[PDB]
Amino acid sequence: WTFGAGAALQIPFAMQMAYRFNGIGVTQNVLYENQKLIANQFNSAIGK
Amino acid sequence: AICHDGKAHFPREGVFVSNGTHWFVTQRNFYEPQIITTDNTFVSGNCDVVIGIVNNTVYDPLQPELDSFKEE
Amino acid sequence: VIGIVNNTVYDPLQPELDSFKE
Numbered sequence: 654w655t656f657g658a659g660a661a662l663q664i665p666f667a668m669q670m671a672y673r674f675n676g677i678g679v680t681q682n683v684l685y686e687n688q689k690l691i692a693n694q695f696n697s698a699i700g701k
Numbered sequence: 702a703i704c705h706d707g708k709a710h711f712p713r714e715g716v717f718v719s720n721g722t723h724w725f726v727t728q729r730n731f732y733e734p735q736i737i738t739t740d741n742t743f744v745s746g747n748c749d750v751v752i753g754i755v756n757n758t759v760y761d762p763l764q765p766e767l768d769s770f771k772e773e
Numbered sequence: 774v775i776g777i778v779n780n781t782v783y784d785p786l787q788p789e790l791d792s793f794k795e
């Protein structure tokens with residue numbers, strides 16, 4: 654979301670998703686441990 | 702994350718950064734580096750799950766106090 | 774800082790080990 658507030662600041666997508674998980678009230682270790690499952694679920698949803 | 706003693710460490714609030722030689726944990730919206738201690742981070746799991754984890758020692762604030770306690 | 778004021782900040786760890794000393 655940095656490019657919407659100012660200059661675009663790069664950040665790895667996994668870390669960005671960790672920030673988002675922290676946003677919804679879920680600890681980032683959950684994502685950093687289930688990254689494969691989250692990625693597969695997102696890809697499957699896009700295909701659907 | 703950070704690998705210290707076979708345990709994965711994650712920042713409580715902030716992000717891990719490196720200037721090229723050493724590692725720090727800093728708030729996301731303003732660069733002010735801090736030494737990675739047990740207070741900045743929380744442990745979760747081990748080192749075999751996280752993708753991209755990097756080893757680095759995690760300082761223990763209570764260790765010097767324990768050393769002094771042992772000494773005197 | 775502007776407006777900082779002087780006050781003792783209690784450290785919980787110190788008495789816990791200090792009492793053990795005696």
Ligand SMILES: *[C@@H]1O[C@H](CO[C@@H]2O[C@@H](C)[C@@H](O)[C@@H](O)[C@@H]2O)[C@@H](O[C@@H]2O[C@H](CO)[C@@H](O[C@@H]3O[C@H](CO[C@H]4O[C@H](CO)[C@@H](O)[C@H](O)[C@@H]4O)[C@@H](O)[C@H](O[C@H]4O[C@H](CO)[C@@H](O)[C@H](O)[C@@H]4O)[C@@H]3O)[C@H](O)[C@H]2NC(C)=O)[C@H](O)[C@H]1NC(C)=O
Nearest residue numbers: 733774775776777778779780781782783784785786787788
């Ligand atoms: C908190 O208290 C401060 C006064 O006492 C200081 O803070 C407390 C918490 C203790 O740590 C105590 O040990 C500290 O000294 C207060 O601001 C303070 O302002 C005084 C000056 O009025 C500073 O005292 C310094 O003393 C040393 C040595 O003392 C001799 O020399 C001075 C020379 O001015 C004489 O006035 C004395 O009577 C002694 O003969 C001085 O070398 C020093 O001089 C210069 O350096 C200080 C640096 O701050 C300047 O403030 C001075 O004006 C001079 O330019 C001082 O006199 C004291 O250092 C200073 N402390 C701080 C943290 O700023 C402070 O307002 C209180 N509240 C806060 C900080 O929120």
Ligand SMILES: *[C@@H]1O[C@H](CO[C@@H]2O[C@@H](C)[C@@H](O)[C@@H](O)[C@@H]2O)[C@@H](O[C@@H]2O[C@H](CO)[C@@H](O[C@@H]3O[C@H](CO)[C@@H](O)[C@H](O[C@H]4O[C@H](CO)[C@@H](O)[C@H](O)[C@@H]4O)[C@@H]3O)[C@H](O)[C@H]2NC(C)=O)[C@H](O)[C@H]1NC(C)=O
Nearest residue numbers: 718719720721722723724725726733734735736737758760
């Ligand atoms: C990446 O960051 C690490 C960690 O240090 C960090 O950067 C420093 C520039 C400084 O801002 C630190 O506060 C900060 O945590 C760097 O590696 C460590 O830091 C310095 C080099 O930067 C070296 O160790 C010592 O660090 C002291 C604290 O900064 C510094 O004062 C020392 O300077 C020596 O010389 C001065 C002047 O004569 C003297 O006053 C000092 O007392 C001391 O003798 C010394 O540099 C080590 O590299 C690391 N030391 C640690 C962690 O304790 C690293 O340099 C930086 N990356 C690059 C490319 O510089």
Ligand SMILES: *[C@@H]1O[C@H](CO)[C@@H](O[C@@H]2O[C@H](CO)[C@@H](O[C@@H]3O[C@H](CO)[C@@H](O)[C@H](O)[C@@H]3O)[C@H](O)[C@H]2NC(C)=O)[C@H](O)[C@H]1NC(C)=O
Nearest residue numbers: 702703704705706707708748749752753754755756757758
């Ligand atoms: C961070 O540190 C850990 C542990 O030191 C690294 O794990 C690496 O894997 C093994 C297990 O301890 C260590 O020895 C290795 O043994 C295997 C099997 O005998 C052997 O094939 C290897 O050649 C190696 O000897 C290894 O020292 C250890 N350290 C490494 C690889 O640096 C982990 O990989 C480290 N991760 C990072 C990002 O540094």
Ligand SMILES: *[C@@H]1O[C@H](CO)[C@@H](O[C@@H]2O[C@H](CO)[C@@H](O)[C@H](O)[C@H]2NC(C)=O)[C@H](O)[C@H]1NC(C)=O
Nearest residue numbers: 731733774775776777778779780781782783784
């Ligand atoms: C907050 O305001 C006080 C005064 O109300 C400030 O202290 C000084 O007090 C004398 C009283 O004679 C005034 O003449 C000065 O104008 C005051 N200085 C200033 C900058 O206002 C004090 O500086 C302020 N301090 C804080 C917020 O810590």
